Amino acid sequence: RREDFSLRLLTQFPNAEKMTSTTPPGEDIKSSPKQYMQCFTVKPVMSLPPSYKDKPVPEQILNYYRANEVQQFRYSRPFRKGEKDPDNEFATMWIERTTYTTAYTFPGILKWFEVKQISTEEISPLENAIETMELTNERISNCVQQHAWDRSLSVHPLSMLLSGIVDPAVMGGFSNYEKAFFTEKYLQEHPEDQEKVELLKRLIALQMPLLTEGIRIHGEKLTEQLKPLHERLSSCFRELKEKVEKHYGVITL
Amino acid sequence: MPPPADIVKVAIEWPGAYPKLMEIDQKKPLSAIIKEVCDGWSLANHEYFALQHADSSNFYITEKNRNEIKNGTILRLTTSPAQNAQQLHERIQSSSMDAKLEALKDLASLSRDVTFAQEFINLDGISLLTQMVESGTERYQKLQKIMKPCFGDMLSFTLTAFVELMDHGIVSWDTFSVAFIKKIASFVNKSAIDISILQRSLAILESMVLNSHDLYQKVAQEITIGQLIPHLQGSDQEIQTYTIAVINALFLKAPDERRQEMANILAQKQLRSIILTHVIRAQRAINNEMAHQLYVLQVLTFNLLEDRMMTKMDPQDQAQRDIIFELRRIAFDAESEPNNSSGSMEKRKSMYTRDYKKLGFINHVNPAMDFTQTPPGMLALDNMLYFAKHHQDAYIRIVLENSSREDKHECPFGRSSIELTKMLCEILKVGELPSETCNDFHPMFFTHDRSFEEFFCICIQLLNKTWKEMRATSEDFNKVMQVVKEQVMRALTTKPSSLDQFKSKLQNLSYTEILKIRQSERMNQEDFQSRPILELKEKIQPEILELIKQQRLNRLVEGTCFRKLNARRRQDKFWYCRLSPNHKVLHYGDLEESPQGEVPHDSLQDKLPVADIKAVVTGKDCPHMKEKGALKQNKEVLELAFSILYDSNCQLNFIAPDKHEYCIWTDGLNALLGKDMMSDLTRNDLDTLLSMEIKLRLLDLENIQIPDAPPPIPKEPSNYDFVYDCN
Amino acid sequence: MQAIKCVVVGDGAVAKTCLLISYTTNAFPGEYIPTVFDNYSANVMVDGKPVNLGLWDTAGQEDYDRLRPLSYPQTDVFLICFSLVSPASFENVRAKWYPEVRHHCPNTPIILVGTKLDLRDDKDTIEKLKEKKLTPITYPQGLAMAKEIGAVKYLECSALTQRGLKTVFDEAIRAVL
Amino acid sequence: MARWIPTKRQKYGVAIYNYNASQDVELSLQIGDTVHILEMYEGWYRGYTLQNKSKKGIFPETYIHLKEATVEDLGQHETVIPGELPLVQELTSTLREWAVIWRKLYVNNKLTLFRQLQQMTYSLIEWRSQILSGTLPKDELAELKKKVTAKIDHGNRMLGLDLVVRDDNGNILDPDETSTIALFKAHEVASKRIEEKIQEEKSILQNLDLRGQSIFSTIHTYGLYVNFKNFVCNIGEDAELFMALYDP
């Protein structure tokens, strides 16, 4: 974990003082003595497995290319931009993900490397919702698929997911989508960017069959203790089914 | 850990029971031992008897006090402490007289028993003392009017029991009622009485003072300075002790505003001088306690001068400005015209300049800038006033001498007075908080109310006479001031006891001949020690101490299989602690039972900067030792238990393999702390090595000796016109 | 290779959400990503062998007591939580959470965990507590409550710090193992 | 500060006690703070210090404990006994060697050897002091010379240093590099004595009576010391005690 690495690096050094605004550098520190540093885990950009562009690639192949032969890196920046409603965190979330283009690709001759070039981004909560929910969906895809090939499996993380998704309990994500984007007030803040909210509608639409594999594989892997779980799951599940049909107004598939 | 000798051949008695000596084992609960003893004396009802040492204690054996059962100490079985408490409720409060008196002598002897005190305070028999000597005083009035010697003895033993049960505090201090202080007052207010009554009554006076400030106020009306003196006049030493202790208490808990008043009343009723003439040079003895009492009297006068010492009063206030003007007039007018007494501001500046460049004052816009540093400020002014009343001779002559010299030989009178007063205040402990620690007393202070002030005047007199004997200047004003302070020290070590003796000693110290005597004493104290060579040795000290420190630091690096909180059951009594050459990271903690000790890796407690480290506490100072539950370790690892502070929640509550390495580690950590060491090994090795080292320096000079004192400097040709050039 | 269930509950004014999300996210203190979903997970090597684990991050309101026991079986450990700077949290836990969670899975290792250690010693905050008669209750009586249950362990962290937070989860995982 | 003179009669630039740093190169001098002076002014002396033989030290003449000569003892005849104070001065230099050598020792903990080092050192220094006069008779000078050379070589064998040579009267006559083969054989003899001494140290570390006969191979006249006190009994009559040695 991050600060175990931070410890090991401070070991390496005297003057064990850390920068704290982990994202940006410090100009005074560009010249001042008393060596500074800052540590923060970053995101290993996915590879581009050649010749695998669409093929029915298994899991091991993808997981191996997931971490290695990497030369791009991002780091997602929580940042408030807009009005800071108390009930929600999403009204302002703007992510200035930082691009990390280094010289070579891990693994390498050296367990580390410099960066050759950096840049940033800027992400709307519209988009934020888009890809965050999206990646959530394929995470569901991962769990369903991994128990679609494996059988002698601990079905427990499936319960993790189905619980956490089924009730956005401490915080209701889906109504948050509705209020933040589906509501026409946003389509006066971002009228032309209804092009975005319709994508999110498409996303929850595609979510529906995806959560449907979640449900059916739960039922296949349902055990008696999973039963109360699954009854609430299926209840709220065809609930959200009709929600996407009409209440979300998304065209299902 | 291991228990002491439990199998102990002790005598076991009961008053009237012939002892039978077995091999008692102390492990079983004391109910069983008392059971076998009582059955041996055919006694049932075991809970109503508790063994007690037949020692002079008469203290009942409970579980708290049976590790005092040593081979040969007779055990005297008797009533258990609760039974003794109940016996005392019925034979301390009752209407019998002889039974009360003897039972109360018992209760006085037995109050020191904490084991008895538990249940007696649960019984609240000190309230029963309240009834027996405040109610009981008016039940037997008709004939106690004639029994008053015996009745006063009874009430004195009541006082003994009251104080020796109040000290426990498990019962609150205010258990007495107001009639208790009425009786104590009748003891202190009235004429002379029995020694025991007056003794314990003054004791209880100072006890209520100790209890609370409200109790102080309510006892003050019964303790009058006019009536507190005959107790001193009560020639017995102890009556004097307690009356002076009450004097100190009245000084202590009074507000400072009333403290000045009571210092004045001490002055007028002769308390200073009368205690001098009753104890100090009289036929009565100065104990350690009398030393404390006289010391706190003098220090209380001192700290009521401290009210003008500590603070920074106005330098430019018009009232103090005018009073220093009248002081400087009665001082300087022997060399001033009558015009400058009330001259204009411009003339004030002019006379400042003329008359204070004769006194080397840097800030001549106001001489109060020589009184703007406190202590004393205004009490240097008070010293000037006292001289105007008592020592205007020394005042005037010292002023005129320095009022006739622009040159640097001058005595800067505002400056000299301020700094003389402040130095003799620190040296003489003028204005300090009274504490029993300092256990001397100066009779010279008790020979005069303002002997502080005459001390200051005589030291200015000796200062300037020795300047005219030591041609002293004001660049040496600090130097020759330290010379005068040395004179004061060579007086005080001889302990002048009055005004005349202080005069004689200081004059004999006035660089006439005894210099050769005291530097001969210095020659004697170098003859086995080589004092100039001591200067040599300790001059470059830090090398050896620093190398010792990094030595021991290396030792921390190579460390040991350290020991833990109760590292006993499959626990790592052995865990490594390797400092990395970082000297900021310590590799230690819950490390396995290590044969070779230190494997250098990220130890289970891998980090330890000096940064989190505040300090270390050793042994019983360890809060895990001060932990009274699951972390109850036995105290023999005192020399092994430390506790270093970091994050104020995680401690280094850990045990050492033995003592000297514990000391070495603590030395290294203090070196990280940048302080002294705490191995005696450290001092021993450092002294022997540096001594031998400097002995390894004499190799050059020997077979011819050293001029110990510094020779003069043979003069040079100031130019660098080298006849033979350098290089 | 193996996995471990665990639940976390606490007062709703503190959002232990932030705790878990910042931990598994591993991101900078006070800079974590706030999500739209609960019930977080972590795949961590603790000692020797890596282990997966997922944390039933549940809503704590009492009317949600009717859904929570359905997941009570096979809760490998539990993480009961509060806020140090919130005596109200003390009341909540001692009176409702502690009792009924003790009832519900009486035989499973339990560790109480502090919160807002940084806020526990915020002088402005604690002076507000005094001007609202809230007590800036410290560790030792918190440990005393731990002894009140005799919990298998107790700790505190702080989200704006991650102090002990790693260690919090360290003892958390190694309690099972 | 001027009027300095080219001479070698200030190589006794020798401190007496502490000084101050009034000059550019001054300080509180130690005892053995010798400065190898060349610039000779009357009241003040400046020349290369022993500690820094590339820098001077300007020090008052009375503060100087000047003696006539150089660091030598026999050219100006500063020997209290001719020629052997050269030995004691080289001894002093050796002592300064032991000084630093132990001033690296403490970091290791072998320091019982450190101890015996200083105890041998105390032997050496008290011998230094006794020879600082013309005290001993000259045969005793010879014997103790052999002893002190023994200690010197013992240290240097401990301390991975050289072999010193020329046991008698100087240790340094031989390294005048005049002969050559004599140098080899003297090195040889010194090696012999070193090996004998290390053997005897590791042997008296174990044995305590073979050493006696090793001493007594040469001498064979001895005296068994007898001291009688009292025959414990009442003889009741005059008696005579006949103590003779008998060989069954």
Residue numbers in the entry:
A (entry chain B): 1390 to 1642
B (entry chain A): 1 to 727
C (entry chain C): 1 to 177
D (entry chain B): 1 to 248
Give the exact sentences the study uses for this entry.
The dedicator of cytokinesis (DOCK)/engulfment and cell motility (ELMO) complex serves as a guanine nucleotide exchange factor (GEF) for the GTPase Rac. RhoG, another GTPase, activates the ELMO-DOCK-Rac pathway during engulfment and migration. The DOCK-A (DOCK1/2/5) and DOCK-B (DOCK3/4) subfamilies specifically activate Rac and have an Src homology domain at their N-terminus; the Src homology domain is involved in autoinhibition and binding to engulfment and cell motility (ELMO) scaffold proteins. ELMO is structurally divided into two domains: an N-terminal domain (NTD), consisting of the Ras-binding (RBD), ELMO inhibitory (EID), and ELMO domains, and a C-terminal domain (CTD), consisting of the Pleckstrin homology (PH) domain and proline-rich region.
The components used in this analysis included DOCK5ΔC, ELMO1FL, RhoGQ61L, and the nucleotide-deficient Rac1G15A mutant (GTPase domain, residues 1−177). From this partial map, we reconstructed the entire RhoG/DOCK5/ELMO1/Rac1 complex at 4.7 Å resolution with an ordered RhoG-ELMO1NTD. In the RhoG-bound DOCK5ΔC/ELMO1FL/Rac1G15A complex, a curved dimer formed, with RhoG located at both protomer tips. Rac1 interacted with the DHR-2 domain of DOCK5 and the PH domain of ELMO1 near the dimer interface, akin to the prior DOCK5ΔC/ELMO1FL/Rac1G15A ternary complex. Notably, ELMO1NTD was disordered in the previous ternary structure. However, in the present RhoG-bound structure, the α-solenoid of ELMO1NTD arched toward the DHR-1 domain of DOCK5 and bound to RhoG in cooperation with the C2 domain of DOCK5. Due to this binding mode, the ELMO1NTD of the RhoG/DOCK5/ELMO1/Rac1 complex had a compact, open conformation that was different from the elongated (S-shaped) open conformation of the DOCK2/ELMO1/Rac1 complex. In the present RhoG/DOCK5/ELMO1/Rac1 structure, the C-terminus of RhoG, Pro181, near the lipidation site, is adjacent to the phosphatidylinositol (3,4,5)-trisphosphate binding site of DOCK5, which includes basic residues such as Lys457, Lys460, and Lys464. Four membrane-binding sites (two DHR-1 and two RhoG) were aligned in the same direction in the dimeric configuration. Thus, the present structure suggests that RhoG and the symmetric DOCK5/ELMO1 dimer can simultaneously bind to the plasma membrane.
